[PDB]
Structure formats: C-alpha cells, structure tokens
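ugh ok so i messed up the first submission bc i forgot one of the chains. this is the corrected input, ALL of the components this time, i swear. 853 residues overall. if the numbers dont match what u have on ur side tell me asap before i send this to the collaborators (the ones from the other lab, u know who)
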Amino acid sequence: LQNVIINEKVNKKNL
Amino acid sequence: MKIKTIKRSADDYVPVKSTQESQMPRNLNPELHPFERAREYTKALNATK
Amino acid sequence: NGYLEPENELEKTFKVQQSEIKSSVDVSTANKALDLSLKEFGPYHIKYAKNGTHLLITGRKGHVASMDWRKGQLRAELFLNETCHSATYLQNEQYFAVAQKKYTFIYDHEGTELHRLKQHIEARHLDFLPYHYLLVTAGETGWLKYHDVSTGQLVSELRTKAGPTMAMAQNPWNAVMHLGHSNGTVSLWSPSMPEPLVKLLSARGPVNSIAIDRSGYYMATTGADRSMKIWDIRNFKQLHSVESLPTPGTNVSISDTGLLALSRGPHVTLWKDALKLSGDSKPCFGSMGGNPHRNTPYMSHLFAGNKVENLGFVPFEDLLGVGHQTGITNLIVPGAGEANYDALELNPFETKKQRQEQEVRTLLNKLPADTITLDPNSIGSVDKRSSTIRLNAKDL
Amino acid sequence: SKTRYYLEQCIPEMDDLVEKGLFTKNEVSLIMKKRTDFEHRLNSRGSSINDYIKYINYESNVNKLRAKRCKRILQVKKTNSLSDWSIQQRIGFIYQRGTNKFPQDLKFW
Amino acid sequence: PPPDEEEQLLAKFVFGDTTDLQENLAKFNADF
Amino acid sequence: SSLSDQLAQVASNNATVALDRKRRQKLHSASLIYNSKTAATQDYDFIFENASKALEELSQIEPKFAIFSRTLFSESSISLDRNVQTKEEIKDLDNAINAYLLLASSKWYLAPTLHATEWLVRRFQIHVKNTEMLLLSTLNYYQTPVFKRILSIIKLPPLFNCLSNFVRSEKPPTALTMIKLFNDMDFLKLYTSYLDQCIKHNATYTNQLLFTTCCFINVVAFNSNNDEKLNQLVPILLEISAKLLASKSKDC
RNA sequence: CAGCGAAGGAUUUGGUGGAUUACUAGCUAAUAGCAAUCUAGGAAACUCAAAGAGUGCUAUGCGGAGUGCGCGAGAGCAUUUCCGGCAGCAGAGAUUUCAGCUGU
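and heres the new structure output, hopefully the right one now
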C-alpha cells in the first residue's frame, strides 16, 4: 500500500 | 595488494611496569557516545537528589 | 583503521583468501582468528560482549560457554539439557541470559543460575539495551517484553499483534527495538507506548534478519523473498533494494565502520561503502564488463557445508565472529572495527577494579525506561503544544 | 586525569605545524604517540627524574628536527608560527614540573 | 629539496623508526 | 576435541601477549636476575642500559658482539615489539636470537652475559617463545644457579618433559635425569642439529663437548642390552661423529 | 612346600585407530560448472574466579627589551620603538654558539 506509517500518539508519560 | 589491520600492540595501552598509569585513549565522536541529552539529564537528576 | 586495496587492475578485493591475509597480517591478529570446532552440540549462536573481551557460544542442543577468547579462559561452561535458542551478555562478563526451551534464565559469571524468569514465557531473541539496563525479549508468542534487570522489575508487556517475532535488532543510537515479523513488517518499538512507533514495510514474506548501523542512521534487512533492503532511519526512506540475491539471506550484520555482512546460507559476503545514499553504493555481485560503478563486495568467504546461523562483528578488532553448525570462526576483515575505542565507557584492557567501578557508574547513570524515544534529542525540548513565543502576562 | 589536559594543551602548535607544510599527520601522530607515553610516565605514580630527563631529551631533539626541516623545506630560519616558541616553552614547563616534584637532585636542578 | 642524512638520523630517533633495525636484522647472516 | 583443551591451545598460543595489568605483571616478573617484587617495577630502559653496558664489556672480552649491538641491542630495540610484526621478520628475529644464544653459550660462568641476556629475556620474551635453543644452549651448566633460575622461569617445552619436577626445586637436576632426557632419538636428532650449527659456526668448546660426549656414552651405556634400540640409535651418533671429524678442533 | 611351564610371568592405566543401524564419492547459485576460481575424604600454586579489609601512593594548575604610568620594582595597563633578517668585520666562546659596527 505504502512504505512507512508513523502514528502520532504523543506520549503522556514523557510529557 | 596491501593489507593492514589494527596494530593494538599491547604496550601503549597496558603499562610496561606495574606502577605507571595506563592510557585511557579516547574518541570524542558523537557516533561513539550515543545519548547526550538523556544521560546528562539523569546526571542532573542525580545531582539534585 | 585498517584497510585493504587492490593497488593493481587485475586482482580484486573479494577473491582474497583468508590463508593469504593470515600470512600477510601480524602474528597477534593471525593468532586471534580462532576457529573452534564443536561438533556434537548444535548450531552455535555467537554473542561477543560490548567490548571485544569475552564470547558467549550457544549450541541449540544444550551448550553455553562464556569464555574469554583472547586469552583462553574458561569462565562458565554448562550443558543444560534443554534447547537454547539464543543468549547474550548483560552488562559485563559477569552476567549472561540464555533463552532456554521455554523459560529465559540468567546466569552468574561462574555458571550458577540466578533467575528463572516466570515471565518471558518463551523466547527466541534477546537483546540488552546497555545504557538503560533493559533486557528485552521477543519470541514465538506475540509479546515483546522489557525487563529492568537492575531492580529486577518488569517494564513493558507489549503485545505485538503480529504473530511471532522473526528477528529483532536494537538501534544503538536511540534504543528502539526493531522487530521483524512474518508480514514483512519491520515495526520499531519503545517501551513507553503500546502501539508500535513506526511500522516499516521492508520485505515480502517473513523478515529473516535486521541489523542497525551503530550511528543509528541505516538499517539493513533481509527477507525470505530473497531480498535485502538498506533503509534510512532518521528520514524513513528506502535507500536501495538489492532484489534477487541467489539464495535467502539468513543474517545481516553491520560493523562499526559501516560494513555490510550478508550470510547467504553457506556464504559470508561483505560489502564496503554500501551505506551511502548514491546509486553507486548499491551492493551488487558483478562489475558487468568491469564496470567501475558497482560494489563488487569487499570480501567473501564460502564455508564448507555448514549453514551460518549468525554473523556478529568483534567490537574493537578487525575481525567478525561467524557462527555455524560445527562451531565458531573468526574472519579477518581488515576494515571492520573502530581502532580508536573510547576508554571512558568500554575498555578492552579493563581490569577488575575499573570493571566494578564502570558498572556501578552506569548503574547510577542508568537512563529511565520512559525516555526511549524515536529521536534522542527530545528531552530538553518544550512541548509541541503550549506555543513557542512566551507571553509575560500582559496580553492574555 | 590531568594527563589529558596536558596532551590537548599541546595540540594547537602541531595543528599549525601540520597545516604549514613541514610535518605530515602520519608522523605528527607518531610524535603525539610518544608524547602521550611520556606524559603518562611523567605524571603517573612512582615516576622519576630519568623520565623527566628523557622527556627533555626527546623534546629538544624534536625541536632540532623542527628547525632542520624548517630551514630545509621552507628555506627560512623560522615561520613566525605558534610552534617556534611553544616547544621550548613547554621544555621549560617540563623543567618546572620536575623541580617542583623533585627538588632533591642538584643534577636536574 | 632533498632529505638530509643527519636529519634522517634525527628522525630515526624522533619517530622511533625501527625499519632500519628490521632491515639490518634481515640483512644479518652468520658470516663468521 | 573438547572446548577446554581446544582453547587451552589458544591460551598457549597467545601466552606471549599481555592483555591486561595482571597478566602483564605476571609476564614481566620473569627475570634471570631480580626477584618478583623487584622485577615488577623495572622499566625497559633501565635493564636496557645496564644490559648495553654488560654487552660492551662482553664485546671487549669477545670481539664478535658489536653486530648484536648494531642489530639487536640497539636503541630502537626497546621499542621493537615481538608479537606485532609479521612471520618473516619474526623469523629473522629468532634466527638472530639463536645466533646470539649459541655465541653466548660459553660465557655463562661470568655475570656480564647474565645481564646481557636478561634484557633479551625481558624484551624479546625468549623464556616463552624461543625456549628450545635457550635450554639446549645452556644445558651444560646444569649444576649452576643460573640454570636453576632459568628453569624456574622457563615454560617447559614438550621434549624436556623429565625436568618438570625440577622447576622451582632447590635441587639441581641430576645426571641420571640428564641421561633420561637424552634417552630418546626425538631429543637426539634435535641435539645433533644443534651440534651441527655449533660446528658450522665453530662455537664448539671444551665444556660443551665434554658434556655432550659424556651424555652420549651414558646413552649408549643404557642401551647396551637393547640390540634393537642400539641399532636404531646408530645413524645419529655416527652421523655427528662424521660431522664432528669434519671440523678442526682437537677437542671435537 | 609343590607342580604348570620354547630366549620371562602377573597386574594398573592414558592416548589413538576400527565397530557399536544396512557400506551409491565432495562443493555450489545444481538437467550444469567446480575439484587451481566464480570472476569482467584432608593438603601443595605463579591454579583461576569473586567479594572484603588494611598498608601504602602525591591523590597533585606573541618574546628580549625599550617606552609613560602602578609605592628601586614588577604584580597590570600599551606597542612598531628596534628586533626575533642577510652576509662580512673583529672581541670571545665549544665545526656551532654569543658580544658591539657597514650596508640592509
């Protein structure tokens, strides 16, 4: 389908 | 065809006599020393503690 | 660093015999190129320490030996009856974890066992994140799980949701673990968030092996589609893709000077200058009509009849330890090592007192298990929210 | 380790001495090798005046070779760089270190 | 600019240039 | 074979190279002169300069040592490392060492050759690597504390295996043990090779020849009542008899 | 004690070699090439490993000047002021170094 998928859940345990 | 490898040579790195101090040969490469920010951040945590 | 070169137009760098370089190299390295022959137990997984100081061999039948290899020093040699898939050192020669038939065990310096892990309910690939003191395990169950080995805690019971984990590999620069499953997906992971950070789709079929460059900047992968890919990592862009090597690549390993190692079953093929971004640096097998714009491989070595189950370079020497069916062989690869190691962290002449002090220094400066990040320079930053220009209570 | 401080105190004179064409790096790394060994033996433990003497002798000899390749390659008496005073000022620094560490022997005095 | 003999005798001390020793060692035979 | 002996082989292979401080001091502490806690603090230049003084006095009492001054006892020799260079120059190195060892085979009654050879031991490591020529060059002086010392510091070769209960024992090895050392043709072909080098260098002398001849007649005495052993032992003793007559010395 | 009884008798134990399954040759990319190449129980130590304590150990930070100030000076300020150039002179000093002049 495509090369790379980078999900964007910013992490609330290194906030 | 010319072949050379490392010549570690075991004399510059371990001392010849049992009192003088060995080298700490040292390469200041960011490639070598991986985590700058996390390591000195944890050193700051240890200093505040 | 060492090197070689043809310095003619007739001979090549790859058709150079190990006998020839063992004759033309000095006596110390020619003596260090050891060839252990162990027949009765199985194929021998090879793990050196983080320096070049020790060596851990595992036969798939029962046989794990932690030994100094430079001087011949038996440290711990044990035949435990069940099968051992892979094993590694923990932080020193003092501790090594063996992935047995199901339960993962860790062991002291002299061979006593210390922990039978009730978790890690099976294991196939272990690794150690050395600055984080994290023993990471993955295997047939879809569970990547992290273990803080200092305080003896678990850290993350990460569900992979991708079947077994065919090959895992540590990124040595931001400490994310790259698993490669049966889907061709090489998904790279951090213990802080359960969802896999970044799901590369490198190959087709299962991924046979992954290997990360020590600068964190390139990833070499081999699949069972007979394909090898080179990856940029910091931009996530497929660099170039060697398709249809004439047999499935079993393992890849990259040295400390950017030196590609591909094990083609009975073969070991090493490419220099294969981790650039050009079109020249695609690793090929022939200079077609003598074409000077190819990577004919730097060296090559065909073994007798034995499948090589894992390559692995020696850290601060110009030789790679390859592990095959009937034992272990070191191969003199003259440009395969950092000559200028840094003695502040890891030292191939380290004695007992500085060994204890260096490990307790790393034990105080262990990074916590949360700061495993996709990029290591995102700790002194500000949040992505709470906008950049500050306002000093005059315009709110 | 203050030996690292002395060893990278001596870098800029050899930097300018290499970037002007009298030595090459393939031999200034050799004199840096022997200088590293000398500095370690000097400010190690259980050192001796003979170690100071051999360091003085080696630095005077590399000073004389510096002047020799200066008048041979560059055909001048000096190149008004940083090196020309630096090598004898660190000879005097070695002498000062040896007198402070070992004020006994009137031979070294 | 030619290299001087006395300069290279000084360079054998400065660099620790043992290739003269190795050459003489190879050249040496039991002639007596 | 097994793993333990399979890497005891590589331990014996790399016994000459020091890998850390403990093995470095356990290797440097071998000396023909000083004991352990004195010898562990010597540097190379110290033993080199007193060895060079011993050499020049030994060279004025025997005019054939200035070549070893020029090529083996030079100032660059303290920086010349043995196990860092290729097989061909290590072949040059140890045949030069063998030349020196047969040349200084006579002088062991007098201490200048002890201080001349002790730097050679401490630097070029002949007490582990070049052990055979050392042993069967100084084998004449077997009732002497120099031989007791050198056998206390040696690593014992596979031929001289009868001596391994005489290491670090205050009793010098006895004449019967010397005969039982000489009593196999694997040793004897070696010793005849060595005597051939001594003949073609004319380094023969009245004490080595006396000792050699006395052990050979004792070997023939032990093999008196063994006809097959005596007929096995003919073509080496008669061989060096004929090679011994080809020289010029009345004693040989 | 006896007898048995051809130039010895009777034991302990290591290593190697051959068997312990039923003998169709080696390698590789395999309808072929290769085989010279796939390229274009107690005790000795220097036996080692791991800890601990004690004794030590130092553990150990532009320049000559000249020019006006800073209370005979350098602890700072500041420089074209000559120099750290060239040969010779002649006073010296162990060929290479200093002392004062010509030009530069």
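quick check: Helices of chain D lie at 3-7, 11-19, 25-42, 49-74, 83-101. that seems consistent at least. Chain D touches chain E at residues 27, 30-31, 34, 58, 61-62, 64-65, 68-69, 72-73 (CB under 8 Å).
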